[PDB]
């Protein structure tokens, strides 16, 4: 009732760790979020940096290597785009 002011500062988007002299702050390329050297210790081709193996966060590093198999997103193109194995 008489409270509601949290002090959320620059933290990690993986462990929620606060960036300090000891814990430096890192940035992702794929998701584009803030991570700690600990979490941001992976590299994977990012379709944003021209498909270059940039330092990405664990998640992304896995998401880019997992290759989702769904179509949950804004208007999607027709399974058949260009003459090829183009999947749905
Ligand atoms: Zn972290
Ligand atoms: Zn990321």
Ligand nearest to the CA of 35: 1
Count of C-beta atoms within a 10 Å radius of residue 19: 17
Q: Which residues contact 51 (CB under 8 A, 6 or more apart)?
A: 45
- Residue ranges with CB less than 5 Å from ion ligand 1: 12, 14-15, 17, 36, 38-39
* Gapped junctions in the chain, after residues (C–N > 2.5 Å): none
Experimental method: NMR
Of the ligands numbered here, which is closest to the C-alpha atom of 13?
1
List beta partners, residue 36: 25
Written out in words, the top-level CATH class of the domain with range 1-77 is: alpha beta
Residue 46 β-bridge partners: 52
Q: Is 15 annotated as a binding residue?
A: yes
């Amino acid at each position: 009732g008489s409270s509601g002011s949290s002090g959320m500062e620059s933290r990690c988007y993986g462990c929620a760790v606060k960036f300090t002299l000891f814990k430096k702050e890192y940035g992702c390329k794929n998701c584009g979020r803030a991570f700690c050297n600990g979490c941001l210790s992976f590299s994977a081709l990012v379709p944003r940096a021209g498909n270059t193996q940039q330092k990405v966060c664990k998640q992304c590093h896995t998401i880019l290597t997992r290759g989702s198999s769904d179509n949950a997103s804004k208007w999607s193109p027709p399974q058949n785009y260009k003459s090829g194995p183009s999947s749905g």
